[PDB]
RNA sequence: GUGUAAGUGCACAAGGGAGCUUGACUGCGAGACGGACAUGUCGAGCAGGGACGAAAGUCGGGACUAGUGAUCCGGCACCUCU
RNA sequence: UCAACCAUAGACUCGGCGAAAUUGCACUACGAGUAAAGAUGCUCGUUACGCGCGGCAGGACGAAAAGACCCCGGGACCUUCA
RNA sequence: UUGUGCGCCGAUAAUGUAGCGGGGCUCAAGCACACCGCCGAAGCCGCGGCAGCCAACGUGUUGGCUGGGUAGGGGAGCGUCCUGCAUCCGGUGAAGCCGCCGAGUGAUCGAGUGGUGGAGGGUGUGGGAGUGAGAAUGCAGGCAUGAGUAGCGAUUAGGCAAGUGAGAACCUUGCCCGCCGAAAGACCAAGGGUUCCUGGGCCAGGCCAGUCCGCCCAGGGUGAGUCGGGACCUAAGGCGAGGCCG
RNA sequence: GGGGAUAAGCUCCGUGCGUCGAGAGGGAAACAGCCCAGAUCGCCGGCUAAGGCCCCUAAGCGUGUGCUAAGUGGAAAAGGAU
RNA sequence: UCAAACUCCGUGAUAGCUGGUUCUCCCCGAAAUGCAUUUAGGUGCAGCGUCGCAUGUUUCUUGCCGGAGGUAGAGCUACUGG
RNA sequence: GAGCCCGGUACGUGAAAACCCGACGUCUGUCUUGAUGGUGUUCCCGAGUAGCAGCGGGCCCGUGGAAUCUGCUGUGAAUCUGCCGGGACCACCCGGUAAGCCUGAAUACUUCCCAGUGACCGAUAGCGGAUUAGUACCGUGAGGGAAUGGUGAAAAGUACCCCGGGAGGGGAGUGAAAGAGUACCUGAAACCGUGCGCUUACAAUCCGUCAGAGCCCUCGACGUGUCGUGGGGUGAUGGCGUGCCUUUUGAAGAAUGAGCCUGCGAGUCAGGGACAUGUCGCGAGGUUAACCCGGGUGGGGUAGCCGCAGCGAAAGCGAGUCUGAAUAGGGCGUAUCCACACAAGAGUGUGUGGUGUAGUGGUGUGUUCUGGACCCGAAGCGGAGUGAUCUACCCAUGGCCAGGGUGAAG
RNA sequence: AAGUGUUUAAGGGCGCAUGGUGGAUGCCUUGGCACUGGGAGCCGAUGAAGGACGUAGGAGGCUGCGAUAAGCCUCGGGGAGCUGUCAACCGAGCGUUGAUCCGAGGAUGUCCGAAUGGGGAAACCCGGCACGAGUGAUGUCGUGUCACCAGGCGCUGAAUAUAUAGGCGUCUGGGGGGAACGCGGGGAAGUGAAACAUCUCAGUACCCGUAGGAAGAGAAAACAAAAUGUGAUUCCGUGAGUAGUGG
């Protein structure tokens, strides 16, 4: 039985070419170049899914730092005071409060300042 | 091949001796087989052993004395060992040879 | 690569060309060249032991007999003249299944001709009985002489 | 085509009752003056083939 | 100083001397060392027949470690093989 | 020295026909670094509106010839007291 | 003076600051010693899914550990074709192809759908493979890039008027001008083979165009006692009756 | 440790030494072999390692006690130096 | 086309050499060492992987105990050499 | 997509002539001028032969102790109490009768003809050749050697009109379909356009990925635009980011290869082969080979092969055997386990009972042997032929060398 | 006055919609491949195999045929259309009084080719003899026949005497082609041995001579081993990868 290769190959070629819509130049037209770019794209996506959590945490920390310095307190002392006070709001919702409900953020800053020690540089 | 080193099949001496093209070989059967295969005894020739599947069909037969023989049996083979003869005669049987 | 026509001469310059080095025009990578590992004539028969074959036939026939798919008849039609209508009616009386196996003697020419044209009927001689034909049939209709011949051949 | 066994291996190796492959030891053809009798005694007879050479010798003998 | 390189030993001598002698044996060999394999190395003890010694005992070459060449092929002697 | 001018054939413009070597890509800068040392593509900086046309040859270790230098293996031919 | 903590000259190459990564910093953002926070990874924890090994109880649940990986070893599968058997779909539209909407842990799937199409397919369970390509300076076909770019084949040179024609730098006619003229003129041999003439044509060819042509089509055309050959003769050389040699 | 001129990003050995090879992630500006740490998948949760917290750039122009004037920090010797 | 023309055939010559070798997932997971080699870019055996079988902690780590060294250090009318 | 429409099929039938097989004859040869079993002796029984020697060939046999057979060269016998052979050779036995000739069947093969078949190919496949095929074309020659299949059920192959010189097209018709128009089934990709949406001319980009404004489209819900468990297209802007393969200690590359697409292109087959491991049958047995008979895949076929006893060079002995002077130790063997004793603590052994031992034939898979053996790739080596129309030299027979100088012998 | 602020596309990118090119895919087939069962196993000087040139009412190719030229005669079959095909377009005609078509046997059969009257660059040149035709005669035409060698038979018998060599005449053969298979001779190298010479490859490739439908071999100067044994040859399976043999 002589077997022609067309159907089996066309299947995966169509899959790869469809996945490469929107690419520039050869990378969206030719199957080989599109396949190379697909390897790179999936590697990039895998790496970026891991890095995205850190990126968003960095953005939240930036916003919380801005809103805390607006209340005359630094981010690190505010985090220490919030941990001491036992409140368990994470940085995502802390930034959400900072942007959407400034009064709530000010109240949390007040409780964090209350929970802080009297001399932060003491050998405690 | 061994990499250019003198191989194992060449650095050892050939096994001693010759083959003796005229060698006579016997198909062997022990008296224990006779006991297990002839519970009633009787005459036991070559082709009874062939029929019982104790020896090959067209070969010289020699009887040996491995087992225990407790049945009166008359055996006709080509050769006997000493212990085979004593075992067959001890049970009252005869051991005639071709 | 060696049976295809021509291609005995090395084609062109190995060097200077800037092209790939080719030793023949009939190399497998060439269009029109030979086949690398292609079909060659061969025999597929296997040396199956006799006991295995006979036991398989017995198992198939016993499976048929467990579900009473075995029938015996004296003769398929009234003798000396083939008649497909009579044989078809008789087979309909015997069974309503689709595929039947008819086992008649080699001298029963009238019955064989009578059941020859029926689409679901396969006619076999008693000494040619085999596992494939038995297992392919919903019913096995035996001739009395054929049945006795099979029993005589085996049970003896 | 039936396999052809090796002639030299057939001449140099033997099989015992339980299938053990048995060979003869070397250094016992000539130059036996300076060799003490204990050395020639330890070189006498046959030993079983070492485990490293068992596969190769079995291959050379069977085919 | 130990025949001979160097090393490890040896004065209890393994170094020096004398008397007898041929174990510079035959059949073996528990157990081991070293090792890819092939090689190589040590070995108590048993039997035969001996040397030396009153005897106990020691002797299967040399204080030890180099002085050597597998297989094939052929020569010589003996064998209750063919 | 030490070059200048003139004319034709190209080069240049218009109409017609219409190739080639080459080609992983591509909206293909520079400096100082770094790196398989030899960076348009990595780092830090500097510079730079998009697209063309005519030119020059510093780079793309430009193209070409599975080097034209050394080694390894295989050949071939030649020499002779192999 | 003695030991010490920091410092200074020594100090110094060739594209451009160039021996803090940059801006900048002694109002340290430098160093030493203590202290307090926070940032920071695919590490650990939290929540959910999967798998391998083992354990417990069961007649498949739970639990504990483990799950980077080249050469390589083992295990389980996707898709293609041909086939035994059994079933199902199809001109009320199979395959193939192009979409949409979805699906699976992967190869992949869609008896889900729309368009195109026009005759064969699917499923289960077995059997057999010319069974899967991205690369061998791989092979065949088609087509890009360079690029509407190079070149358009000598050293003589063309012009104008009229004509024909759908169309004229190139075809026809005329008048000029120029070039060869021991040739670029005339005639044979070899070679070619109808290219010769008449009429017709203008897709291919002609390095542009073409109404023209050594191009395409049809028909026609070659006349020997003396010309060149044979029927006459031999050279070198070839073949060689018998023959000699092998 | 040897060879070399204890020169080499030289060469040869030893190492229940490591890593890369065959190892992603974080740090060292970039940086196979250095430091932290071994990626089964998902999360817009948390805690930390190395390394960091003026701006680039996430987090301290943090606190206390001292030193430095050399931009030392942010490369180098013999030696010189109120 | 010539340090032995060309064509076909032996023939699918032979290359320890170069290049290539096509779907998926799950589990495990190296070596670049030793010996020998007309041997050094090859190969044979061993070392290290995997699968199956058999055997059970025999492997490993830590504590304690019993052992042999001739390195670092040191020393030298304790020897040999400078 | 037809058993009942057509050609056919099962089944019957048919030869003037030619040829081929038989048969019966004419015809020919031949025996009968014949036959038997008996008795004692001379002659004959294949000559340049057998044998021998020298040098070779070929036999499992590579000159070997080398028989049998055979070529050339020398020498060279006997006729039956003769000769040859039985693996140097001799004696004895046994077998046969060299140097004369014919001989069918069983066996090998297919240019060609007829009838069939395929878990063979289906137009880059299958023959090189489905089409002008050994053709075109290439070469002086021997020789090498292609590419090119499909409208439709029927040509019904588009009358007529219009633009155009035509080509081509638009109407109109034919057709079930002209998204079937003799550039014709289906009509993929690379490649080349046109139209619409978003974006892009201060910007250093392995061209993606993660966040993401704005714009456009779409599905739901409520009003008039405004969210949602939404979905798609494009994306200003920010973060991260050194192409694939091969070879490598190590390459994003400045080591290798690739312009692109579509087709094609590399662990296969044979053998009762070898080893291992699944699975099936039978089991101390298992199994047939050639072959014979069945229109098959079925039945028969015991010759063999492998297990069933080992040890030893062998004679041989045998649960033992070999070495050896040795019961004196060792080597190999007696499936394995268990119990009981007697010995030893030099490692455990020796016995008595039980227990009872597993092979073999198909077939799957992985390695392996011999075969081109996973595929591709030399320079070269042999055999047989083709070439001196180029060029080297030679042979025969012709031709050509403007013009002007100089001035030897005689 | 200071500040904020859309809007450009010469061209390019991406997506979508529509085309072109190209000829993949799917489905096929007057083609091949591998076999099975039969038949026939030779053709040729009575001119072969294979060709050149011609030949139909019209140009060419394939097919058929040969100056009697898609054909002639006889015997059979068959039965209504036919004048082979590419491949039609005409133009002419045949057929129930049997066409076209199929089978068997005959006739014709240019030229080349073993090629054979002589020559020759295959397919084209020039003849002798005999018998006919034609011409006033020469010219010309038609039909037979004319190679060489071998072996029979007959005649003759050189140098030369016997004689023979040779010569003359007449009969019968041969020559060449063909795919495989057969027999007898000659006989490589690449390769393997990890080099290489003995050896292997391999008595292979190739070459020479010869057949036949098959061939070769074949009727014991055989084996065998004490069996009161087999009984020409050939082929198949085992024996057996064994006994052996081998740098």
């Amino acid at each position: 039985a002589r077997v022609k290769r067309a159907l089996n190959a066309q299947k995966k070629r169509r899959t790869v070419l469809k996945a490469s819509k929107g690419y520039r130049g050869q990378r969206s037209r030719l199957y080989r170049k599109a396949k190379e770019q697909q390897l790179h794209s999936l590697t990039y996506a895998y790496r970026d899914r891991r890095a995205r959590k850190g990126e968003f945490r960095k953005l939240w920390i930036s916003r919380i730092n801005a809103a805390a310095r607006a209340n005359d307190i630094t981010y690190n002392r505010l985090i220490q005071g919030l941990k001491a006070a036992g409140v368990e709001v994470d940085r995502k919702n802390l930034a959400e409060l900072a942007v959407s409900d400034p009064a709530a953020f000010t109240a949390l800053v007040d409780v964090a300042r209350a929970a802080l020690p009297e001399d932060v540089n003491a050998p405690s | 091949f061994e990499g250019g080193q003198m191989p194992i099949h060449m650095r050892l001496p050939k096994l001693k001796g010759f083959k003796n093209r005229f060698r006579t070989e016997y198909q062997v059967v022990n008296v224990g087989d006779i006991n297990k295969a002839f519970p009633q005894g009787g005459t036991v020739g070559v082709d009874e052993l062939v029929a019982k599947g104790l020896v090959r069909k067209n070969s010289l037969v020699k009887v040996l004395g491995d087992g225990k023989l407790t049945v009166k049996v008359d055996v006709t083979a080509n050769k006997f060992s000493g212990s085979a003869r004593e075992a067959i005669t001890a049970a009252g049987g005869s051991a005639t040879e071709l | 690569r060696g049976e295809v026509s021509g291609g005995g001469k090395k084609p062109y310059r190995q060097k200077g060309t800037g092209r790939a080095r080719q030793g023949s025009t009939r190399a497998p990578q060439f269009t029109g060249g030979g086949t690398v590992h292609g079909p060659k004539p061969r025999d597929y028969s296997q040396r199956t032991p006799k006991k295995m074959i006979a036991a398989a036939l017995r198992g198939a026939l016993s499976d048929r007999a467990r579900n009473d798919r075995i029938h015996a008849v004296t003769e398929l039609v009234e003798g000396q003249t083939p008649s497909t209508k009579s044989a078809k009616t008789f087979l309909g009386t015997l069974t309503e299944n689709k595929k039947v196996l008819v086992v008649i003697g080699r001298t029963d020419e009238v019955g064989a001709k009578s059941v020859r044209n029926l689409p679901g009927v396969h006619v076999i001689s008693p000494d040619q009985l085999n596992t494939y034909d038995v297992l392919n049939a919903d019913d096995v209709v035996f001739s009395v002489e054929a049945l006795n011949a099979y029993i005589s051949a085996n049970s003896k | 085509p039936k396999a052809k066994t090796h002639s030299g291996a057939s001449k140099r190796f033997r099989r015992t009752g339980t299938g053990k492959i048995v060979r003869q030891k070397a250094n016992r053809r000539h130059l036996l003056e300076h060799k003490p009798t204990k050395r020639t005694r330890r070189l006498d007879g046959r030993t079983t083939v070492s485990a490293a050479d068992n596969s190769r010798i079995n291959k050379l003998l069977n085919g």
Side-chain angles (χ1 to χ4, degrees), chain A residues 75-107:
Chain A
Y75 165 90
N76 63 351
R77 292 304 172 196
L78 162 75
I79 286 301
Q80 162 191 26
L82 275 192
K83 182 203 135 158
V87 4
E88 303 304 23
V89 185
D90 61 4
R91 287 142 186 79
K92 176 179 84 157
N93 305 122
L94 273 187
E96 193 44 34
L97 281 193
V99 172
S100 321
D101 200 333
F105 195 90
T106 311

Short mmCIF file of all heavy atoms in Angstrom, two decimals, chain A residues 75-107:
data_model
loop_
_atom_site.label_atom_id
_atom_site.label_comp_id
_atom_site.label_asym_id
_atom_site.label_seq_id
_atom_site.Cartn_x
_atom_site.Cartn_y
_atom_site.Cartn_z
N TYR A 75 6.37 53.26 52.51
CA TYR A 75 5.74 51.98 52.21
C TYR A 75 6.19 50.90 53.18
O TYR A 75 5.38 50.08 53.62
CB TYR A 75 6.04 51.58 50.76
CG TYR A 75 5.74 50.13 50.46
CD1 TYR A 75 4.49 49.74 50.01
CD2 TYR A 75 6.70 49.15 50.65
CE1 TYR A 75 4.21 48.42 49.74
CE2 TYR A 75 6.42 47.83 50.39
CZ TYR A 75 5.18 47.47 49.94
OH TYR A 75 4.92 46.15 49.68
N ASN A 76 7.48 50.86 53.50
CA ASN A 76 8.00 49.77 54.33
C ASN A 76 7.46 49.86 55.75
O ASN A 76 7.04 48.84 56.33
CB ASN A 76 9.53 49.78 54.31
CG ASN A 76 10.12 51.03 54.91
OD1 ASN A 76 9.41 51.99 55.20
ND2 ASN A 76 11.43 51.03 55.09
N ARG A 77 7.44 51.06 56.33
CA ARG A 77 6.87 51.21 57.67
C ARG A 77 5.38 50.92 57.66
O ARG A 77 4.85 50.35 58.62
CB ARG A 77 7.13 52.62 58.19
CG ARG A 77 8.58 52.92 58.50
CD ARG A 77 9.17 51.94 59.48
NE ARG A 77 10.60 52.13 59.63
CZ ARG A 77 11.43 51.25 60.16
NH1 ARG A 77 11.00 50.08 60.62
NH2 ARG A 77 12.73 51.53 60.24
N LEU A 78 4.69 51.29 56.58
CA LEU A 78 3.26 51.01 56.50
C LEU A 78 2.99 49.51 56.44
O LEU A 78 2.07 49.01 57.08
CB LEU A 78 2.66 51.71 55.29
CG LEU A 78 1.31 51.17 54.83
CD1 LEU A 78 0.21 51.63 55.76
CD2 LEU A 78 1.01 51.62 53.42
N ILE A 79 3.79 48.77 55.66
CA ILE A 79 3.61 47.33 55.59
C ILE A 79 3.92 46.69 56.94
O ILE A 79 3.19 45.80 57.40
CB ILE A 79 4.48 46.74 54.47
CG1 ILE A 79 3.88 47.06 53.10
CG2 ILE A 79 4.62 45.24 54.62
CD1 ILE A 79 2.48 46.53 52.92
N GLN A 80 4.98 47.14 57.60
CA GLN A 80 5.30 46.61 58.93
C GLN A 80 4.17 46.88 59.91
O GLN A 80 3.78 46.00 60.68
CB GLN A 80 6.60 47.22 59.44
CG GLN A 80 6.79 47.09 60.93
CD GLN A 80 7.95 47.91 61.44
OE1 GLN A 80 8.32 48.92 60.85
NE2 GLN A 80 8.53 47.48 62.56
N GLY A 81 3.61 48.09 59.89
CA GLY A 81 2.53 48.42 60.80
C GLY A 81 1.26 47.65 60.51
O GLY A 81 0.54 47.25 61.43
N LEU A 82 0.94 47.46 59.23
CA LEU A 82 -0.23 46.67 58.87
C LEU A 82 -0.07 45.22 59.31
O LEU A 82 -1.03 44.61 59.79
CB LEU A 82 -0.49 46.75 57.37
CG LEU A 82 -1.29 47.96 56.89
CD1 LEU A 82 -1.72 47.78 55.45
CD2 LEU A 82 -2.49 48.20 57.78
N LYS A 83 1.13 44.66 59.14
CA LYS A 83 1.38 43.31 59.62
C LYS A 83 1.26 43.23 61.13
O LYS A 83 0.72 42.26 61.67
CB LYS A 83 2.76 42.85 59.16
CG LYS A 83 3.12 41.44 59.56
CD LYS A 83 4.63 41.25 59.59
CE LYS A 83 5.08 40.52 60.84
NZ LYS A 83 6.40 39.88 60.65
N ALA A 84 1.77 44.24 61.84
CA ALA A 84 1.66 44.26 63.29
C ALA A 84 0.21 44.35 63.75
O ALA A 84 -0.19 43.70 64.72
CB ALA A 84 2.48 45.42 63.86
N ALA A 85 -0.59 45.17 63.07
CA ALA A 85 -1.99 45.33 63.42
C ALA A 85 -2.83 44.10 63.09
O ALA A 85 -3.98 44.02 63.53
CB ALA A 85 -2.58 46.55 62.72
N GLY A 86 -2.29 43.16 62.33
CA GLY A 86 -2.99 41.93 62.02
C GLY A 86 -3.93 41.98 60.84
O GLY A 86 -4.54 40.96 60.51
N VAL A 87 -4.07 43.14 60.18
CA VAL A 87 -4.92 43.22 59.00
C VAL A 87 -4.29 42.43 57.86
O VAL A 87 -3.07 42.44 57.67
CB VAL A 87 -5.17 44.69 58.62
CG1 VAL A 87 -4.37 45.61 59.52
CG2 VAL A 87 -4.83 44.95 57.16
N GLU A 88 -5.13 41.71 57.12
CA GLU A 88 -4.68 40.76 56.12
C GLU A 88 -5.18 41.12 54.73
O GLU A 88 -5.68 40.26 53.99
CB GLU A 88 -5.11 39.34 56.50
CG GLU A 88 -4.65 38.83 57.87
CD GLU A 88 -3.14 38.86 58.13
OE1 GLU A 88 -2.38 39.63 57.51
OE2 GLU A 88 -2.71 38.08 59.00
N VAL A 89 -5.07 42.38 54.35
CA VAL A 89 -5.40 42.82 53.00
C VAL A 89 -4.13 42.79 52.17
O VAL A 89 -3.09 43.32 52.59
CB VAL A 89 -6.03 44.22 53.01
CG1 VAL A 89 -6.47 44.60 51.61
CG2 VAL A 89 -7.20 44.25 53.97
N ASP A 90 -4.19 42.17 51.00
CA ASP A 90 -3.00 42.03 50.18
C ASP A 90 -2.77 43.29 49.35
O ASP A 90 -3.60 44.20 49.31
CB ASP A 90 -3.09 40.79 49.29
CG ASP A 90 -4.26 40.85 48.32
OD1 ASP A 90 -4.97 41.87 48.28
OD2 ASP A 90 -4.47 39.85 47.60
N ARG A 91 -1.62 43.33 48.69
CA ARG A 91 -1.20 44.54 47.99
C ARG A 91 -2.14 44.87 46.83
O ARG A 91 -2.29 46.05 46.48
CB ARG A 91 0.23 44.38 47.50
CG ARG A 91 1.25 44.46 48.61
CD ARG A 91 2.38 43.48 48.39
NE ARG A 91 3.29 43.45 49.53
CZ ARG A 91 3.06 42.80 50.66
NH1 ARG A 91 1.95 42.10 50.84
NH2 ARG A 91 3.96 42.85 51.63
N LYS A 92 -2.78 43.87 46.24
CA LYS A 92 -3.72 44.13 45.16
C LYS A 92 -4.89 44.97 45.63
O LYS A 92 -5.18 46.03 45.08
CB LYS A 92 -4.20 42.80 44.58
CG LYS A 92 -5.25 42.93 43.50
CD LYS A 92 -5.65 41.58 42.97
CE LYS A 92 -6.69 40.93 43.85
NZ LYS A 92 -7.47 39.91 43.10
N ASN A 93 -5.56 44.52 46.70
CA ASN A 93 -6.68 45.28 47.22
C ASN A 93 -6.23 46.52 47.97
O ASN A 93 -7.00 47.48 48.07
CB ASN A 93 -7.54 44.39 48.12
CG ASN A 93 -8.00 43.14 47.41
OD1 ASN A 93 -7.72 42.02 47.85
ND2 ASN A 93 -8.69 43.31 46.30
N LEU A 94 -5.00 46.55 48.47
CA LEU A 94 -4.48 47.78 49.04
C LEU A 94 -4.35 48.87 47.98
O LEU A 94 -4.74 50.01 48.20
CB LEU A 94 -3.14 47.52 49.71
CG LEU A 94 -3.20 47.07 51.17
CD1 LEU A 94 -1.80 47.03 51.76
CD2 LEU A 94 -4.10 47.99 51.97
N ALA A 95 -3.81 48.52 46.81
CA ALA A 95 -3.74 49.48 45.71
C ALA A 95 -5.14 49.84 45.22
O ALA A 95 -5.39 50.99 44.85
CB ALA A 95 -2.90 48.91 44.57
N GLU A 96 -6.05 48.87 45.22
CA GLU A 96 -7.43 49.17 44.85
C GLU A 96 -8.04 50.20 45.79
O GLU A 96 -8.72 51.13 45.34
CB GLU A 96 -8.26 47.89 44.85
CG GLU A 96 -9.62 47.99 44.18
CD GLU A 96 -9.60 48.74 42.86
OE1 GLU A 96 -8.60 48.65 42.12
OE2 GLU A 96 -10.62 49.40 42.54
N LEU A 97 -7.82 50.05 47.09
CA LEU A 97 -8.28 51.04 48.05
C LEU A 97 -7.61 52.39 47.82
O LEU A 97 -8.26 53.43 47.88
CB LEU A 97 -8.01 50.57 49.48
CG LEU A 97 -8.95 49.54 50.08
CD1 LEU A 97 -8.70 49.44 51.57
CD2 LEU A 97 -10.38 49.93 49.80
N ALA A 98 -6.30 52.37 47.56
CA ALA A 98 -5.57 53.62 47.36
C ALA A 98 -6.13 54.41 46.19
O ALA A 98 -6.21 55.64 46.24
CB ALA A 98 -4.09 53.32 47.14
N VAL A 99 -6.52 53.72 45.12
CA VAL A 99 -7.03 54.43 43.95
C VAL A 99 -8.50 54.79 44.11
O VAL A 99 -8.91 55.90 43.79
CB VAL A 99 -6.78 53.59 42.68
CG1 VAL A 99 -7.47 54.22 41.49
CG2 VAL A 99 -5.30 53.45 42.42
N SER A 100 -9.31 53.86 44.62
CA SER A 100 -10.76 54.03 44.59
C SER A 100 -11.33 54.65 45.86
O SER A 100 -12.25 55.47 45.77
CB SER A 100 -11.43 52.67 44.35
OG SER A 100 -10.69 51.91 43.41
N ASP A 101 -10.82 54.29 47.03
CA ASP A 101 -11.35 54.75 48.31
C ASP A 101 -10.22 55.34 49.13
O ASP A 101 -9.67 54.68 50.02
CB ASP A 101 -12.05 53.62 49.06
CG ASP A 101 -13.01 54.13 50.11
OD1 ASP A 101 -12.80 55.24 50.63
OD2 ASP A 101 -13.98 53.41 50.42
N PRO A 102 -9.83 56.59 48.86
CA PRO A 102 -8.74 57.20 49.63
C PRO A 102 -9.01 57.32 51.11
O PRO A 102 -8.07 57.25 51.92
CB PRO A 102 -8.59 58.58 48.97
CG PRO A 102 -9.19 58.42 47.61
CD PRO A 102 -10.33 57.48 47.80
N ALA A 103 -10.28 57.49 51.51
CA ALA A 103 -10.60 57.58 52.93
C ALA A 103 -10.28 56.27 53.65
O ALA A 103 -9.74 56.27 54.76
CB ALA A 103 -12.07 57.95 53.11
N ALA A 104 -10.62 55.14 53.03
CA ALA A 104 -10.29 53.85 53.62
C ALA A 104 -8.79 53.66 53.73
O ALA A 104 -8.29 53.13 54.73
CB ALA A 104 -10.91 52.72 52.79
N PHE A 105 -8.04 54.08 52.71
CA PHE A 105 -6.59 53.99 52.78
C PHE A 105 -6.04 54.84 53.91
O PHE A 105 -5.11 54.43 54.61
CB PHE A 105 -5.96 54.39 51.45
CG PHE A 105 -4.53 53.98 51.32
CD1 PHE A 105 -4.19 52.75 50.79
CD2 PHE A 105 -3.51 54.82 51.73
CE1 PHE A 105 -2.88 52.37 50.68
CE2 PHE A 105 -2.20 54.44 51.62
CZ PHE A 105 -1.88 53.22 51.09
N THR A 106 -6.60 56.04 54.11
CA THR A 106 -6.16 56.88 55.21
C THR A 106 -6.46 56.23 56.56
O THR A 106 -5.64 56.28 57.48
CB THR A 106 -6.81 58.25 55.13
OG1 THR A 106 -6.67 58.77 53.80
CG2 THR A 106 -6.16 59.21 56.10
N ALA A 107 -7.63 55.61 56.69
CA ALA A 107 -7.96 54.91 57.93
C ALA A 107 -6.99 53.77 58.19
O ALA A 107 -6.52 53.58 59.32
CB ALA A 107 -9.39 54.39 57.88
#
